[PDB]
Design an enzyme around this catalytic site. Sequence first.
Site, PDB file in Angstrom:
ATOM      1  NE  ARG A  85      -1.234  -1.112   4.629  1.00  0.00           N
ATOM      2  CZ  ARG A  85      -0.582  -2.247   4.890  1.00  0.00           C
ATOM      3  NH1 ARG A  85      -0.348  -3.155   3.930  1.00  0.00           N
ATOM      4  NH2 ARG A  85      -0.142  -2.465   6.126  1.00  0.00           N
ATOM      5  CG  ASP A 114       0.035  -7.766   2.886  1.00  0.00           C
ATOM      6  OD1 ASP A 114      -1.119  -7.397   2.610  1.00  0.00           O
ATOM      7  OD2 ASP A 114       1.028  -7.060   3.271  1.00  0.00           O
ATOM      8  CB  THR A 115      -0.727 -14.373   3.892  1.00  0.00           C
ATOM      9  OG1 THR A 115       0.591 -14.464   4.415  1.00  0.00           O
ATOM     10  CG2 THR A 115      -0.738 -14.364   2.362  1.00  0.00           C
ATOM     11  CB  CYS A 138       1.512 -21.842   1.710  1.00  0.00           C
ATOM     12  SG  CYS A 138       2.259 -20.691   2.924  1.00  0.00           S
ATOM     13  CG  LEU A 139       7.683 -23.226   0.444  1.00  0.00           C
ATOM     14  CD1 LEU A 139       8.883 -22.343  -0.104  1.00  0.00           C
ATOM     15  CD2 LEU A 139       8.084 -24.629   0.716  1.00  0.00           C
ATOM     16  N   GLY A 140       5.063 -21.733   4.012  1.00  0.00           N
ATOM     17  CA  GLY A 140       4.864 -21.243   5.368  1.00  0.00           C
ATOM     18  C   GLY A 140       3.611 -21.870   6.012  1.00  0.00           C
TER      19      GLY A 140
HETATM   20  C1  HEM Z   1      -2.426 -17.521   6.825  1.00  0.00           C
HETATM   21  C2  HEM Z   1      -1.210 -17.261   6.272  1.00  0.00           C
HETATM   22  C3  HEM Z   1      -0.786 -17.690   4.881  1.00  0.00           C
HETATM   23  C4  HEM Z   1      -1.569 -17.990   3.795  1.00  0.00           C
HETATM   24  C5  HEM Z   1      -3.074 -18.038   3.633  1.00  0.00           C
HETATM   25  C6  HEM Z   1      -0.701 -18.228   2.700  1.00  0.00           C
HETATM   26  C7  HEM Z   1      -1.137 -18.663   1.415  1.00  0.00           C
HETATM   27  C8  HEM Z   1      -0.270 -18.975   0.384  1.00  0.00           C
HETATM   28  C9  HEM Z   1      -0.641 -19.438  -0.903  1.00  0.00           C
HETATM   29  C10 HEM Z   1      -2.102 -19.562  -1.370  1.00  0.00           C
HETATM   30  C11 HEM Z   1       0.428 -19.639  -1.632  1.00  0.00           C
HETATM   31  C12 HEM Z   1       0.499 -20.218  -3.091  1.00  0.00           C
HETATM   32  C13 HEM Z   1       0.242 -19.144  -4.121  1.00  0.00           C
HETATM   33  C14 HEM Z   1       0.183 -19.736  -5.514  1.00  0.00           C
HETATM   34  O1  HEM Z   1       0.223 -20.932  -5.693  1.00  0.00           O
HETATM   35  O2  HEM Z   1       0.051 -18.904  -6.426  1.00  0.00           O
HETATM   36  C15 HEM Z   1       1.594 -19.378  -0.796  1.00  0.00           C
HETATM   37  C16 HEM Z   1       2.909 -19.495  -1.218  1.00  0.00           C
HETATM   38  C17 HEM Z   1       3.947 -19.110  -0.415  1.00  0.00           C
HETATM   39  N1  HEM Z   1       3.941 -18.717   0.940  1.00  0.00           N
HETATM   40 FE1  HEM Z   1       2.258 -18.558   2.064  1.00  0.00          FE
HETATM   41  N2  HEM Z   1       0.620 -18.152   3.145  1.00  0.00           N
HETATM   42  C18 HEM Z   1       0.541 -17.771   4.457  1.00  0.00           C
HETATM   43  C19 HEM Z   1       1.612 -17.677   5.311  1.00  0.00           C
HETATM   44  C20 HEM Z   1       2.972 -17.747   4.907  1.00  0.00           C
HETATM   45  C21 HEM Z   1       4.118 -17.698   5.845  1.00  0.00           C
HETATM   46  C22 HEM Z   1       3.929 -17.480   7.373  1.00  0.00           C
HETATM   47  C23 HEM Z   1       5.203 -17.760   5.053  1.00  0.00           C
HETATM   48  C24 HEM Z   1       6.636 -17.717   5.596  1.00  0.00           C
HETATM   49  C25 HEM Z   1       7.603 -17.003   5.052  1.00  0.00           C
HETATM   50  C26 HEM Z   1       4.823 -17.943   3.685  1.00  0.00           C
HETATM   51  C27 HEM Z   1       5.651 -18.164   2.599  1.00  0.00           C
HETATM   52  C28 HEM Z   1       5.215 -18.518   1.321  1.00  0.00           C
HETATM   53  C29 HEM Z   1       6.070 -18.803   0.201  1.00  0.00           C
HETATM   54  C30 HEM Z   1       7.626 -18.593   0.290  1.00  0.00           C
HETATM   55  C31 HEM Z   1       5.284 -19.176  -0.916  1.00  0.00           C
HETATM   56  C32 HEM Z   1       5.743 -19.483  -2.363  1.00  0.00           C
HETATM   57  C33 HEM Z   1       5.846 -21.001  -2.479  1.00  0.00           C
HETATM   58  C34 HEM Z   1       6.248 -21.372  -3.914  1.00  0.00           C
HETATM   59  O3  HEM Z   1       5.935 -20.538  -4.802  1.00  0.00           O
HETATM   60  O4  HEM Z   1       6.769 -22.539  -4.056  1.00  0.00           O
HETATM   61  N3  HEM Z   1       3.413 -18.053   3.636  1.00  0.00           N
HETATM   62  N4  HEM Z   1       1.115 -18.975   0.438  1.00  0.00           N
HETATM   63  C1  CAM Z   2       0.541 -15.775  -1.445  1.00  0.00           C
HETATM   64  C2  CAM Z   2       2.022 -15.400  -1.543  1.00  0.00           C
HETATM   65  C3  CAM Z   2       2.795 -15.591  -0.249  1.00  0.00           C
HETATM   66  C4  CAM Z   2       2.714 -16.068  -2.741  1.00  0.00           C
HETATM   67  C5  CAM Z   2       4.052 -15.313  -2.781  1.00  0.00           C
HETATM   68  C6  CAM Z   2       3.675 -13.885  -2.356  1.00  0.00           C
HETATM   69  C7  CAM Z   2       2.175 -13.982  -2.053  1.00  0.00           C
HETATM   70  C8  CAM Z   2       1.641 -12.900  -1.117  1.00  0.00           C
HETATM   71  C9  CAM Z   2       1.437 -14.231  -3.364  1.00  0.00           C
HETATM   72  O1  CAM Z   2       0.430 -13.425  -3.938  1.00  0.00           O
HETATM   73  C10 CAM Z   2       1.904 -15.549  -3.944  1.00  0.00           C
END
Ligand code: HEM
Ligand code: CAM
EC number: 1.14.15.1
Length: 394
Positions: A166, A231-232, A337-339
Amino acid sequence: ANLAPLPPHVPEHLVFDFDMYNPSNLSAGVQEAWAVLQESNVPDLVWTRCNGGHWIATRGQLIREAYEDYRHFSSECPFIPSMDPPEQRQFRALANQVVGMPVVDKLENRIQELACSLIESLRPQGQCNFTEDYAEPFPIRIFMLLAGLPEEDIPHLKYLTDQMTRPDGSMTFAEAKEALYDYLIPIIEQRRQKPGTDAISIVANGQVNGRPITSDEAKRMCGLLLVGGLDTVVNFLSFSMEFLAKSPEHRQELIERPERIPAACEELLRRFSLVADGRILTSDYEFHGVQLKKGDQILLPQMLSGLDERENAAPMHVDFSRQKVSHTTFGHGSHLCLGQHLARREIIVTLKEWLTRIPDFSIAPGAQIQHKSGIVSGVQALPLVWDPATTKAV
Ligand code: HEM
Ligand SMILES: CC1(C)[C@@H]2CC[C@@]1(C)C(=O)C2
């Protein structure tokens, strides 16, 4: 009205002009606004002319199928208007050494200590703006702990990340990104030379394809680990706390039945799912009777799979005792999601710690909560209040 003209391979009977950044009924709540796409007159795959023109898959079956099929639905352009398998598997495997389940299990009480410090600060105030005062500081403090970065850098990192989602006008999205890389590069270089056990040391010392990770690969991996968990989490914790402030019976349920907190987390992740990203067609491809063209973008909203009545009954109602909670809130397929494990522990720790210390809280009188829609939908602000005499300094 900002509509792109319909491409000639797209039949008119599939056109529904949903705008992911400004859906019609946003004051009903963002998930509700998006669920217009699941009304029974709307086909499972539609084309919108908003935002340049793109497909939308509206049902869980199609959203999962497309995310499974990375050969046809590429992540090279996931944002509307970046790697696929085997390189992507190498980078994931490296990221998993930073945020995989074993790390999160070792780190769980560091996360709880941060939550308790934040919550105990706020508790005697009897009010807060949850988004600002807990939802943002908690994941950024976890990042600084995991990445071995000092407290004094928080405000400048938060600032750079806020400019991506933002901007106030101070910085272009490109300057924000470069500023972040400028901050990370010298610490990646230092920790290649003198590693610790923090996240940046683990990344800076990985191998891709038989050789040391480059500076450029490592800054991008660190950058994605930082922005991915901000942001997620901020927005998901705010959607969940908005619901709990409005539903005292669900607060009571978890206070009486704390063993249900992990299931409640899963059910909140289904009901207040919030990501909607996309893919781009790598070739012409017929998908469920519909001709897709090479280069077409398709929005595959992770938010919608769990709201699909075909996946979960009475999907707008929150039921922590659902036998099967079906959702794609962390995605599906090769980019899942790795997280996901770190995020579940952050949610469970926040539910346990908040309802321990501040079991009875409400939306501030007179406040109307407003949502925002986009690739990561969210909560603009969440003013909460409570009677300090009902809290527990445990
Ligand atoms: C409620 C919290 C979270 C939600 C709903 C969320 C959701 C997602 C989703 C939907 C994606 C896949 C996007 C796609 O396929 O286009 C993603 C990817 C990812 N998230 Fe999360 N996430 C959250 C928390 C986090 C946390 C805590 C981390 C830690 C750093 C994180 C790191 C990542 C990364 C690095 C990817 C990319 C994975 C890849 O492209 O192989 N996420 N997340
Ligand atoms: C959901 C994510 C964590 C993933 C990498 C950045 C992010 C916010 C996306 O819109 C794809």
